[PDB]
Design an enzyme around this catalytic site. Structure first.
Site, short mmCIF file in Angstrom:
data_model
loop_
_atom_site.label_atom_id
_atom_site.label_comp_id
_atom_site.label_asym_id
_atom_site.label_seq_id
_atom_site.Cartn_x
_atom_site.Cartn_y
_atom_site.Cartn_z
N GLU A 75 0.83 -1.21 0.00
CA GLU A 75 0.00 0.00 0.00
C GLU A 75 0.86 1.26 0.00
OE1 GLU A 75 -3.03 0.78 -0.69
OE2 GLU A 75 -4.52 -0.13 0.63
N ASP A 76 1.62 1.42 -1.08
CA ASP A 76 2.49 2.56 -1.39
C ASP A 76 3.70 2.67 -0.47
OD1 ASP A 76 0.15 2.82 -2.76
OD2 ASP A 76 -0.40 4.78 -1.92
N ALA A 77 3.84 1.78 0.51
CA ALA A 77 4.97 1.87 1.43
C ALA A 77 6.26 1.46 0.74
CB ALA A 77 4.73 1.01 2.66
#
Ligand SMILES: [Mg+2]
Ligand SMILES: [Zn+2]
Ligand SMILES: [Zn+2]
Lengths: 65, 48, 94, 49, 147, 56, 256, 302
Positions: free
Chosen positions: D4-6
């Site tokens: 999740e975009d991390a």
């Protein structure tokens, strides 16, 4: 503002050969061959040497005391 | 409570007492901005 | 190094190994896998921040030997292999 | 841990000075002068006050 | 800590993985950053992959790669020089797992991408109040983090 | 007869409030749990004394 | 266990390890990376600093300077490191450049390996004076204590059939890239001691024309040092550390 | 004037009465943490040592609260404030830390630091639905950011591109019980909006499930043991290997996935990977006739 001592990926020392690399680059030679003869083979160390720009000389002129 | 200060432009040491200062400036060059010099007490900084 | 037993059964041994990382954990797990008397030999890290230095090991044997004996044999095999590799490395340069 | 975009960063890279930053904050103090000659004073306050 | 690429790919650091646990390629390169493969095609970000290829090519050759709009170095030319440099055209490299030590079954795409740290650091964004000052009017907790 | 989620939550809250300021536990305790955990174990053991009034 | 040395340089060694499995090679690599102890600047006491760089930046740059580790005096294989502190004192006045060789070490054998590492540039009237305290540490705690870099790859043999078109191009490319190539009457075998990647035109033959086999239990290891320790002694130190860890685990099991 | 004070978004009714700032609340960035359960939230140590749970001293938690008081506010796990039964609140400093601990008795209240298993609220704004806040369990880690499990992200509509999330610590026992019973995370897996799963696997979970359960996916004994230990499954003994390759046993990914499901579970359906309806129709027909098809028969035309 100053060249990092070690490569960010593997810790290989690059500050010793940076000024020689910069001097040879200003002489018109291909920076790839300059990196090759200086032992900078991995492209991470080549990334660290090529992408760095010297800026400390423009910070020393502003005295703080 | 007088103390020594460093000038911003000329950099020479400027001596004045801030408690009873009618005006704070460097008399050597007329600069009105001063820097507090770093103390000589040894400070310890952790390496990264 | 420290061994903290969590759950012990008639053929199962579960323990935390404080002060160690993935290196010795993986080496010991694979050395236990090299033993034919160990039915199950696994390790895990429940959290890479809070307990990154505390791997958890589960060793289940077939009942022929105790899990502690299997772990000791695996550690001895690791020591012997490391000694052999060190001697070969010394002979390679000298 | 990159879900999740991390993103995942290298501990050795961070310890070697990669993406190291310094944050400067400036505070101001003025010896303001009030009516009737009252003014602020630059001194270490006494514990009795 | 918020880190963002130049193509709108942004995110916080999820883990500080030690170098021994990070994977490494057959050429001996350990990535300084790891991003999820799910975000690349969902947001239709091919410029990030082209920039990674160009950064790898520029690092290997020593010559900076032009990335100007509509007059930049073509992607196919970049793949051609990457092939001529001894690497795969797609930029994928054979990587080994940092924990198990075994070879990964898929060739991992690794390249040099310009990533910038933003000012939205977690140091200036963490706020924790249990009890303290209250407003003089509503007898309610104050506004912001400075007070 | 069954307990709704709201009724169970109200019973547990009342029992925890009673335990916090008195009301000794009717069952054994693990020596360190919070009063909420004590009310939870009391409910799990089916020993709670609090009933629910329902309109009829 | 058979050891074959491919290349030796005063800062690096590339060799081939045979008879060990993947977990042992990974354990050796991780022990070299994070468990082998070296000397690095841990603390800095600052007397004067008028340079553009901050105290933290200068301290971090000092920590990145490789320091020679006297492995003879200090048992680097011990699980508990000696609490020995080495003081490097610098007192320089501008203008000029501060190098790693200008540091005055309190121990003769614990000195910066590279004396040509720039630290900071000092202008006119700027002076820098500090004492750097260095102690033994491991790479698992900080990157300053890493003895260098280490990696390994699978020793793989690439068999290219002579029926594959332009096999001579692959053979000459492998010869140019310094790879051992053997030639037979049916196929050519390339030993991938380095990173070898096939071009796009040979990708269609990777399933049936060109094959790759992995030699069981053989790896190509490359270990490079920054001057803190001799490149031959790092592997021995890591193996002794593994032996000490095994002995400590045996002792803990006996205690349990 | 008074009319503008009463009306408007910033007015008393909306900005001060319907919604107002609360105490014992924190707010910071969230980062992924698959290693914790959906019931758990990653609370930083700095946040935990600041937010305090007021726990009354009883006959069973007297020793724990005494140790919390004796630790002090600067040592974890510790306490920040102590309230006597009469009602005077004393802040714990270094000087009176031992004196208050010796004076602790039944009926006293200790504002202890956030401990593992404590119930706290986890809310992300905007709160469009009742599932935007859930009660998690406190997990204390020494970093600075919040940590939330990934399947709980779709309920919060939160990614990790700098998202900021708030945490609320209930103080009264009734509020804690209400949070634990009603607003617990696992109690809100199914979304009431459409009667379907909301707390669910996304992205890498789906990709890993496909990689594990696809045809031709086999794993070695070491890999199977490692994934069993990583997932925390109570598999004491490995199952029978599906096939042997090069003299070593291999386990199918379907066999490993089967250990997650309950032993009395049977369901068949079609997924989004359907592009040859003939095989699906044959499988449906085979299931329809026998109603207990042989596992060998299913695997022949799987
Ligand atoms: Mg977002
Ligand atoms: Zn490098
Ligand atoms: Zn002046």
């Amino acid at each position: 503002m100053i060249v990092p001592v070690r490569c960010f990926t593997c810790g290989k020392v690059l500050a010793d050969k940076y000024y020689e690399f910069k001097k040879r680059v200003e002489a018109g030679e291909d920076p790839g061959k300059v990196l090759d003869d200086l032992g900078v083979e991995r492209y991470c160390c080549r990334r660290t040497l090529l992408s760095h720009v010297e800026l400390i000389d423009q910070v020393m002129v502003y005295k703080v005391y | 409570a007088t103390a020594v200060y460093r000038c911003a432009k000329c950099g020479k040491e400027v001596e004045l007492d801030l408690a009873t200062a009618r005006e704070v400036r460097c008399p050597y060059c007329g600069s009105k901005i001063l820097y507090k010099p770093r103390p000589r007490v040894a400070r310890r900084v952790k390496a990264i | 190094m420290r061994i903290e037993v969590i759950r012990r059964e008639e053929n199962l041994l579960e323990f935390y190994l404080e002060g160690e990382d993935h290196t010795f954990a993986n080496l010991l797990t694979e050395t236990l896998h090299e033993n034919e008397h160990v039915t199950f030999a696994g390790y895990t890290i429940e959290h890479p921040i809070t307990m990154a230095r505390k791997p958890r090991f589960k060793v289940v044997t077939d009942g022929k030997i105790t899990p502690e004996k299997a772990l000791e044999e695996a550690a001895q095999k690791i020591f012997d292999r490391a000694r052999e590799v060190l001697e070969a490395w010394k002979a390679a340069i000298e | 841990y990159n879900m999740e975009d991390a993103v995942i960063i290298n501990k050795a890279s961070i310890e070697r000075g990669l993406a190291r930053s310094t944050f400067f904050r400036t505070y101001e103090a003025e010896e303001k002068r009030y009516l009737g000659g009252q003014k602020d004073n630059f001194e270490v306050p006494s514990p009795n006050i | 800590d918020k880190f963002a690429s130049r193509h709108g790919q942004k995110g916080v650091i999820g883990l500080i993985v030690p170098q021994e646990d990070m994977p490494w390629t057959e050429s001996g390169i350990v990535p300084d950053l790891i991003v999820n493969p799910h975000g690349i095609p969902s947001r239709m970000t091919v410029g990030q992959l082209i920039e990674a290829i160009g950064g790898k090519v520029a690092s290997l050759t020593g010559r900076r790669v032009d990335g100007t709009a509509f007059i930049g170095e073509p992607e196919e030319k970049l793949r051609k020089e990457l092939e001529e440099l001894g690497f795969k055209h797609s930029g994928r490299e054979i990587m080994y797992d940092g924990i198990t030590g075994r070879r990964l079954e898929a060739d991992i795409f690794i390249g040099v991408i310009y990533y910038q740290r933003l000012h939205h650091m977690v140091a200036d964004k963490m706020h924790a109040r249990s009890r303290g000052p209250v407003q003089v009017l509503t007898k309610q907790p104050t506004e912001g983090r400075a007070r | 007869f069954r307990y709704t989620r709201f009724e169970k939550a109200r019973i547990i809250g009342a029992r925890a409030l009673q335990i916090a300021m008195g009301a000794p536990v009717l069952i054994d305790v693990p020596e360190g749990i919070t009063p909420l955990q004590a009310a939870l174990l009391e409910f799990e053991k089916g020993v709670i004394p609090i009933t629910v009034i329902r309109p009829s | 266990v058979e050891f074959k040395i491919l290349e030796k340089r005063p800062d690096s060694i590339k060799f081939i390890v045979s008879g060990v499995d993947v977990p042992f090679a990974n354990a050796l690599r991780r022990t070299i990376l994070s468990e082998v102890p070296t000397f690095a600047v841990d603390e800095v006491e600052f007397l004067e600093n008028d340079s553009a760089l901050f105290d933290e930046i200068i301290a971090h740059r000092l920590a990145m300077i490789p320091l020679t580790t006297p492995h003879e005096r200090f048992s680097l294989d011990a699980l508990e490191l000696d609490d020995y502190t080495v003081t490097l004192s610098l007192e320089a006045e501008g203008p000029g450049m501060v190098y790693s060789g200008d540091l005055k070490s309190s121990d003769g054998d614990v000195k910066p390996a590279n004396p040509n590492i720039p630290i900071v540039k000092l202008a006119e009237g700027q002076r820098l004076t500090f004492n750097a305290y260095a102690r033994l540490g491991r790479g698992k705690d900080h990157a300053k204590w890493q003895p260098g870099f280490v990696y390994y790859k699978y020793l793989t043999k690439i068999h290219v059939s002579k029926d594959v078109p332009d096999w001579e191009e692959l053979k000459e490319l492998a010869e140019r890239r310094g790879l051992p190539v053997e030639e037979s009457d049916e196929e050519i075998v390339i030993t991938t001691i380095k990173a070898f990647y096939l071009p796009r035109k040979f990708e269609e033959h990777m399933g049936k024309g060109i094959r790759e086999e992995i030699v069981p239990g053989s790896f190509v290891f490359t270990v490079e040092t920054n001057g803190e320790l001799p490149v031959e002694e790092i592997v021995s130190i890591a193996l002794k550390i593994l032996m000490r860890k095994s002995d400590r685990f045996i002792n803990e099991l006996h205690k349990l | 004037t008074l009319a503008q004070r009463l009306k408007g978004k910033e007015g008393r009714f909306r900005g001060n009465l319907s919604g107002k700032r609360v105490n014992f609340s924190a707010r910071t960035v969230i980062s992924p943490d698959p290693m914790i359960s959906i019931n758990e939230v990653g609370v930083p140590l700095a946040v935990a040592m600041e937010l305090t749970v007021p726990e009354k001293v009883t006959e069973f938690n007297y020793e724990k609260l005494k140790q919390r008081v004796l630790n002090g506010p600067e040592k974890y796990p510790g306490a920040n404030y102590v309230i006597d039964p009469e009602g005077r609140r004393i802040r714990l400093m270094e000087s009176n830390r031992e004196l208050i601990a010796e004076k602790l008795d039944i009926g006293w209240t200790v504002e202890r630091h956030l401990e593992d298993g404590d119930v706290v609220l986890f809310n992300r704004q905007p709160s469009l639905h009742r599932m935007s806040i859930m009660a998690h369990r406190v997990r204390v880690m020494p970093y600075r950011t919040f940590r939330l499990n990934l399947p709980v992200c779709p309920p919060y509509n939160a990614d990790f591109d700098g998202d900021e999330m708030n945490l609320h610590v209930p103080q009264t026992e009734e509020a804690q019980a209400e949070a634990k019973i009603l607003m617990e995370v696992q109690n809100h897996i199914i979304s009431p909006r459409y009667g379907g799963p909301l707390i669910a696997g996304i992205q890498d979970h789906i990709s890993g499930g496909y990689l594990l359960t696809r045809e031709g996916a086999y794993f070695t004994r070491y890999e199977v043991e490692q994934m069993l230990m990583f997932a925390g499954m109570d598999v004491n003994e490995l199952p029978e290997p599906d096939k042997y390759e090069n003299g070593e046993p291999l386990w199918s990914g379907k066999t490993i996935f089967s250990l997650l499901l309950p032993d009395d579970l049977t369901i068949w359906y079609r997924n989004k990977l359907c592009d040859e309806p003939e095989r699906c129709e044959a499988l449906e027909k085979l299931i329809e006739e026998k109603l207990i098809p042989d596992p060998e028969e299913v695997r022949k035309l799987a």
